[PDB]
Amino acid sequence: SEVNKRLRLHTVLFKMKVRTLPHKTVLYKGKPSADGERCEAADKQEAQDNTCLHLEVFDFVGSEDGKSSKNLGAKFKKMELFFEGSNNADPDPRKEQPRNLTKIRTYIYQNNFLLEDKVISVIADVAPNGEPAHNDKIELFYQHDDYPVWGTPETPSEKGVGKYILSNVENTKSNPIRNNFKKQFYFKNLDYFDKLFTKIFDYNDRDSNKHYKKNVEALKGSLKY
Amino acid sequence: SEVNKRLRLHTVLFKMKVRTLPHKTVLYKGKPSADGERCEAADKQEAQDNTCLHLEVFDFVGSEDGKSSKNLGAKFKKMELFFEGSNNADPDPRKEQPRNLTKIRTYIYQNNFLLEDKVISVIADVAPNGEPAHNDKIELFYQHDDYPVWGTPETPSEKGVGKYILSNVENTKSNPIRNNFKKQFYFKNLDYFDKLFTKIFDYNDRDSNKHYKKNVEALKGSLKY
Amino acid sequence: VSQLVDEIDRIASQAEFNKMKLLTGAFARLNPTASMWFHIGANMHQRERVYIETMNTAALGLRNPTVLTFISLSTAGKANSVIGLCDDALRVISKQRADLGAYYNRMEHAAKG
Amino acid sequence: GLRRAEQNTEDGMSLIQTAEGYLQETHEIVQRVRVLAVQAANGIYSEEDRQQIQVEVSQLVDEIDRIASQAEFNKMKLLTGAFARLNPTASMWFHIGANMHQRERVYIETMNTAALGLRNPTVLTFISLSTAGKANSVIGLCDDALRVISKQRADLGAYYNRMEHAAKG
Amino acid sequence: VDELLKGELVPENLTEDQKKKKKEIMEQESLWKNPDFKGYNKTFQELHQLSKTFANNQFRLALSNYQSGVNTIMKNRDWVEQYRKEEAEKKRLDEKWYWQKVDRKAREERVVYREKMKAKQDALNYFSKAINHLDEIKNPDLRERPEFKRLLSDVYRSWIMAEYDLQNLPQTIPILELYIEIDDNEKEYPAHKYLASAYSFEENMIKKTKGPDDMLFKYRYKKNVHLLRATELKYGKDSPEYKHIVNVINRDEVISV
């Protein structure tokens, strides 16, 4: 797919301060927490100590029927990029070289208050770059109504329940779960956050040009007298 | 019959690009398969290597009763023409010497759904030209609900079943099946497909005329300024 | 117009005599589900066929039988073309009204005879 | 059944005719505002004069709300949005036949000051004429206020003609 | 590679184990040969909807509706071209004032406009019937074949183009979305151009009728998504055209600081 290679260019966000964010979008940077499960927001967002990106997009249940304000539930889909090694010495974020990805974590949350339905889906790919076919290194974790508890591995009796790897499921013509998973959700999910990451940087990069132009404009006010 | 000569003049479609398909008409060029039972469309449609002319005519059961859209029948009639010898080197299909037919395949299909009555009647002629009376080389394969197997010959004890040559059938004054078949089915189907062959060849020539008209018309339209 | 076209479809499906639907196209001529015969004799083969044609908004041409979109009267441009369909609509209605009278008279003299 | 069902249609026509009865008074009061907004739109009046024009508008917009609140048909409010399409609390179905699946739905939308645009559903402040500039912008709003009332009366008249034909048949 | 040149969804006709199975099945049914039999239970007969012959048949019906619907548009262009050709060829012996030309020319346009709009609805019915033939096939094995992918794209392509002329923009949204889920159709800019207009059309309708902001954002978001996506597929990324669109979307959407 070569998509995750293009995600390597998104390391410029570490040394660039984030001011322009789209509606219902949350982004910050920090250091990996214990066990490398998630990211912990650093107190300073410009230091080289940070090695991770956190990006969250949240929505509301009932926005498809105009009842978003009715408080029918909450949902959010967020993805993170894990980087290895320290940042470059210079603090300029314009010139940053592509860097490898430790792992790509996909988090899906969807809770319905009235139906008392809650779906939490976690997808982690510990081998983003290095091998085009790394199915066995893709961890899937499905939780439904707080069952099973976090960290419970898949059992042969309950297939698909709990944390497991992508290679467990079949790719038969009868139930091509794996092939559909790549075509239906995974390919579109990566591209959606790929464009969004570029969307955030270009917006904040543009504001750098304007403030240079704003100073030029106020200086021309002296030419009239 | 004097129809096969008209069929031998249809060799101009190998190097002619066809896009204007008449109603209920399918045409393509390909190469003979193993034992010449069927044909497969080549990857390249303008290549001289093609030696086949597959003309398919759509039909339906229930269109006469207006219940075709109710999924109550299925039938179609198609024929295949096999040539010999490589086509001429020039890419212009307008000038093309007539090419003899290696063999003629007639494929008549009929499949009722409610009655579960499926009838397949395939007629193959391997001596299209040279011998006006070539009944000994016209295979008549009749299959009704997968009875018998494909290509199974006919035994004198159980006549009328499987693939048999036209020389087997009686032609007595009581049952002149030979003269009955030619007047009822074969002669009608030959001219129907032969005339359709001429329509397709001339229809794409008209499209060239329209493309000729489109260019010249725009040239003189710039004289208004 | 949406109210008027709705009523016509309502009438066609709800036109019922002795738990039998009539104006929905059940007893048409080309593709009928049921054929109506009346016994006007005391013998074995004294039977005459009766036809009631389809009289829904699809048959009248007001609405497309496939897309189920009816006539447009929100624009004066197509409002002029709406009149032409109305002439065709009433004519098909008028033709069937004469047929019902024609069958009625054929039966009326038979009762007299 | 058919005789009793035809009696239901007349009961239905009682609902639609009575429902349209209040919309004429609502139409009258808005047209009273429309000409008044033209009066204050000109600059010959001071702010003291325009205040007395607003005193009339205080009652007129108030009287529109009391129409929707007290509008009843068989102890059931109609114009308060309770029978609308998008966010209804009840559905108005009329049974006009002698069989089981023969009933039609009638939508009566919202006809309070908030619905017509003359009031803010959130801020809860209505239009005022105490300013010459404000009065110029009330002429445009009262025009679209009339459009909604006219649109609703078009539908009530549309159903009533259909209900009239059904009873005859 | 031409999928339509095949002329069938799949050519349906080896193993001795399978051949022996065929011979014993045909004789069981041959003893029960009742051509006038009609089963009281439809469940066993419904299994024929999974056959290759059934799918090989519904493909022809949709193709016939598609091919016939093509000729409606094709013949319309020939008529209009011949119509305006004859208007300028016939002599106008009663024409000596300038405003005579303006009215006569304007009369031709209304004649032509009637011809085109009549052709569209005439062609649209064939396209709509083609859709219903493709959606009733219940063989997932045969739904992924190249022939099915080509025709379902062509039927949707002509269906959306014809529906656009009749100002039925909101009805093209479901069909357009199903069109961009097949093969490389998502890489074509025209498919994303209509989505920009169609979602803009729905955006105005909610805006015009003063609906909830929730549906406004949904149509606004999908508008900007396919407006920028269509820009990428035509001029390329970081093009001067692409840069201007971002500025337009910048003021259009909502940002947080």
- State the Cα–Cα distance between residues A116 and A73, nearest whole angstrom: 9
CB B55 within 8 A of CB B49: no
Helix, strand, or coil (residue B87): coil
CB A210 within 8 A of CB A21: no
Helix, strand, or coil (residue A52): strand
Q: Torsion angle, CA of E29/E31/E37/E42, rounded to 10 degrees?
A: -30
Angle between helices E52-89 and E98-134 (to 10 degrees): 180
Structure-determination approach: cryo-EM
Judged by a CB distance cut-off of 8 A, whether residue A25 touches chain E is yes
Residue with tokens 């399978």, as numbered in its chain = E18
CA distance E3 to chain B (A): 10
Residues in chain D with CB shorter than 8 Å from the CB of C7 are: 162, 165-166
Q: Which spans in chain D are helix H? A: 2-40, 47-70, 132-168
CA distance C9 to chain D (A): 12
The distance from CA A119 to its chain's CA centroid, rounded to whole angstroms, is 18
A 10 A CB-CB count for D129 gives 26
Angle between helices D47-70 and D2-40 (to 10 degrees): 170
Judged by a CB distance cut-off of 8 A, whether residue B163 touches chain E is no
Q: Do B146 and E22 touch (CB under 8 A)?
A: yes
Residues in chain B with CB shorter than 8 Å from the CB of C29 are: none
Tokens of E184: 């490389």
Tell me which DSSP letter residue D72 carries: B
Q: Do D161 and C3 touch (CB under 8 A)?
A: yes
- State the Cα–Cα distance between residues C19 and D99, nearest whole angstrom: 10
**C3 → closest Cβ in D97, D99, D159:** D159
Start-to-end C-alpha separation, chain B: 61
DSSP string, B113-178: SSS--EEEEEEEES--SS-S--GGGEEEEEEESS-S-TT-B--SSSTTSEEEETTTS-B-SS-BHH
- State the Cα–Cα distance between residues B104 and B123, nearest whole angstrom: 8
Q: Do B67 and C31 touch (CB under 8 A)?
A: yes
Tell me which DSSP letter residue B62 carries: S
Interface size, chain A vs chain E, as Cβ–Cβ contacts under 8 Å: 35
Q: Do E30 and B145 touch (CB under 8 A)?
A: yes
Tokens of E23: 């011979």
Residues in CB range of A160: below 8 A, 6 or more apart: A142, A154, A169
Residues in chain E with CB shorter than 8 Å from the CB of A63 are: 214, 217-218
Query: Structure resolution in Å?
Result: 3.2
Helix, strand, or coil (residue D30): helix
Judged by a CB distance cut-off of 8 A, whether residue E124 touches chain C is yes
Residue with tokens 């579960």, as numbered in its chain = B116
Q: What angle do CA A172, A173, A175 make, to 5 degrees?
A: 70
CA distance E129 to chain C (A): 7
Q: Chain E, 44-73: which have a CB under 8 Å from a chain B CB?
A: 45, 48-49, 53-54, 56-58, 60-61, 63-64, 67-68, 71
Chain gaps in chain E, named by the residue before each (C–N > 2.5 Å): 13
Q: One-letter amino acid identity for B14?
A: F
- State the Cα–Cα distance between residues B13 and B33, nearest whole angstrom: 20
Task: Please give the C-alpha separations between residue D141 and each of B206, D58, D81, D149, in angstroms, as whole numbers.
Answer: 61, 16, 21, 13
Return the closest-CA partner of residue B216 out of A70, C52, B208. B208
Subunits next to D (3 or more Cβ pairs <8 Å) are C
Residues in CB range of A44: below 8 A, 6 or more apart: none
Return the closest-CA partner of residue B194 out of B33, B53, B94, B39. B53
Angle between helices E146-165 and E52-89 (to 10 degrees): 40
Helix, strand, or coil (residue D162): helix
Q: Do E129 and C66 touch (CB under 8 A)?
A: yes
- Please state the three-class secondary structure of chain E as a single string: CCCHHHCCCCCCCCCHHHHHHHHHHHHHHHHCCCCCCCCCCHHHHHHHHHCHHHHHHHHHHHHHHHHHHHHHHHHHHHHHHHHHHHHHHCCCCCCCCHHHHHHHHHHHHHHHHHHHHHHHHHHHHHHHHHHHHHCCCCCHHHHCCHHHHHHHHHHHHHHHHHHHHCCCHHHHHHHHHHHCCCCCHHHCHHHHHHHHHHHHHHHHHHHHHCCCHHHHHHHHHHHHHHHHHHHHHHHCCCCHHHHHHHHHHHHHCCEEC
Tell me which DSSP letter residue C63 carries: B
Instruction: Determine the residue among C64, C66, C72, C81 to mutate to test chain E binding: the one whose Cβ has the most chain E Cβ atoms within 10 Å.
Output: C66
Helix (H) or strand (E) holding C80: helix C76-112
Judged by a CB distance cut-off of 8 A, whether residue C80 touches chain E is no
Tell me which DSSP letter residue D91 carries: -
A 10 A CB-CB count for B4 gives 18
Q: Torsion angle, CA of A92/A98/A103/A106, rounded to 10 degrees?
A: 80
Tokens of C112: 């007299």
CB C10 within 8 A of CB D104: yes
